[PDB]
Amino acid sequence: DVRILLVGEPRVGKTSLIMSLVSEEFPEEVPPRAEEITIPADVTPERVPTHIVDYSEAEQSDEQLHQEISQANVICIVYAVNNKHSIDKVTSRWIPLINERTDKDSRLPLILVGNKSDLVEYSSMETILPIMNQYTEIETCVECSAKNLKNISELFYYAQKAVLHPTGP
Amino acid sequence: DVRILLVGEPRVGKTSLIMSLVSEEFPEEVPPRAEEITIPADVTPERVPTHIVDYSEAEQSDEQLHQEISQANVICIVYAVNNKHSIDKVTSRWIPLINERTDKDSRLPLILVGNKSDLVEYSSMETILPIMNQYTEIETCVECSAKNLKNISELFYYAQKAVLHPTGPLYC
Numbered sequence: 001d002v003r004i005l006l007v008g009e010p011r012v013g014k015t016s017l018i019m020s021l022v023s024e025e026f027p028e029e030v031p032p033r034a035e036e037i038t039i040p041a042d043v044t045p046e047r048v049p050t051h052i053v054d055y056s057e058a059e060q061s062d063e064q065l066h067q068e069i070s071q072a073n074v075i076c077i078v079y080a081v082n083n084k085h086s087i088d089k090v091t092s093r094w095i096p097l098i099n100e101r102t103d104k105d106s107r108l109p110l111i112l113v114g115n116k117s118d119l120v121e122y123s124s125m126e127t128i129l130p131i132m133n134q135y136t137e138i139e140t141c142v143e144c145s146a147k148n149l150k151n152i153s154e155l156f157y158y159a160q161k162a163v164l165h166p167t168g169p
Numbered sequence: 170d171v172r173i174l175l176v177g178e179p180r181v182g183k184t185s186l187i188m189s190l191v192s193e194e195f196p197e198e199v200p201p202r203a204e205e206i207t208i209p210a211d212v213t214p215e216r217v218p219t220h221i222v223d224y225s226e227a228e229q230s231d232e233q234l235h236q237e238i239s240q241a242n243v244i245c246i247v248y249a250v251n252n253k254h255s256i257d258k259v260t261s262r263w264i265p266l267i268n269e270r271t272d273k274d275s276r277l278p279l280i281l282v283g284n285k286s287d288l289v290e291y292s293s294m295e296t297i298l299p300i301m302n303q304y305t306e307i308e309t310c311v312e313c314s315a316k317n318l319k320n321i322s323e324l325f326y327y328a329q330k331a332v333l334h335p336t337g338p339l340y341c
């Protein structure tokens with residue numbers, strides 16, 4: 001199975017991203033944590049289902065976060081393109097937290113997700129490129145907007161492919 | 170060296186994409202074909218020297234297109250999200266033509282680029298997902314907007330990564 005987990009600082013748009021995918025429409029309001037979302041195996045050529053899991057610090061303990069990290073086989077670290085603090089925390093908090101707990105005999109791909117592209121005129125790539133170069137665990141990066149749905153489809157396609165295309169050609 | 174070639178139907182935005190990458194501003198006027206671009210290693214996403222080549226049917230012959238395909242080590246097939254014809258030509262023209270190359274001993278990764286995302290509120294993913302499924306030589310896909318400077322840095326990062334770190338399934 002593909003088991004996707006979204007982590008990242010509060011209010012970067014994790015839940016909104018998941019619920020925008022669900023309804024193909026931006027929800028004006030969201031709960032702290034979305035329900036688990038299922039993509040049936042019919043979608044991928046590998047005939048494998050996808051599960052999408054949300055994390056909310058307001059609702060969940062660090063013990064629960066660690067277990068979610070253990071269950072996931074691809075982790076989207078979400079930041080907001082208009083929030084430097086959320087980007088800083090990718091390297092000061094999220095990557096070390098995940099890496100400390102990953103199986104060193106294996107690989108857990110990470111995807112850097114820059115949400116709220118609808119708010120800004122310029123790219124976050126210049127800022128996140130040095131993070132990419134440092135951590136080969138990061139499989140790819142994407143900028144998107146839950147508000148207008150742009151690149152949301154790509155986001156979860158990339159996450160699936162990080163698991164289903166995990167080696168070379 | 171990463172050697173990128175942009176192909177695709179007329180007016181999908183190949184030249185505008187390249188010039189928006191260079192200038193970080195959308196050119197309201199573009200020539201038919203950008204001049205060949207050579208970018209130093211330490212200013213590119215993957216830290217390797219990068220060449221970017223533009224194709225223009227009015228400016229170049231079929232022989233020159235054939236030469237450019239053999240020289241590239243990643244090809245971005247550009248379509249316009251609001252032009253179904255430019256999408257149909259991805260499979261009817263561009264992929265077969267690329268597979269006419271003579272030296273097939275090395276994989277030539279492809280990237281599907283849906284430009285002009287500023288014009289529409291829907292994704293082209295449903296349309297191009299069947300293409301991705303049928304043609305495993307396609308490494309990834311991206312939707313961008315030269316006009317709004319969206320996902321242009323991503324596009325060229327994806328292109329470099331296809332050369333240096335191509336991907337594939339666990340089992341064939």
Ligand SMILES: Nc1nc2c(ncn2[C@@H]2O[C@H](COP(=O)(O)OP(=O)(O)OP(=O)(O)O)[C@@H](O)[C@H]2O)c(=O)[nH]1
Pocket residue numbers: 008009010011012013014015016017027028029030031032033055056057058115116117118119144145146147148
């Ligand atoms: N403009 C804009 N606003 C967004 C976008 N995505 C989410 N928001 C807004 O950002 C705020 C936070 O969104 P959430 O989905 O609750 O973010 P979260 O990461 O789940 O927050 P926590 O659960 O507290 O960690 C809400 O007001 C959303 O409406 C976006 O893409 N663009």
Ligand SMILES: Nc1nc2c(ncn2[C@@H]2O[C@H](COP(=O)(O)OP(=O)(O)OP(=O)(O)O)[C@@H](O)[C@H]2O)c(=O)[nH]1
Pocket residue numbers: 177178179180181182183184185186196197199200201202224225226284285286287288313314315316317
């Ligand atoms: N709205 C919008 N228009 C674009 C975008 N990119 C290019 N255009 C416009 O599309 C037209 C064609 O752009 P070109 O860059 O000349 O496209 P091309 O693929 O190089 O065309 P040929 O060289 O003739 O094959 C021009 O009017 C551009 O201004 C875009 O991202 N959004």
Ligand SMILES: [Mg+2]
Pocket residue numbers: 014015016031032033034054055056
């Ligand atoms: Mg939430």
Ligand SMILES: [Mg+2]
Pocket residue numbers: 183184185200201202203223224225
């Ligand atoms: Mg041109």
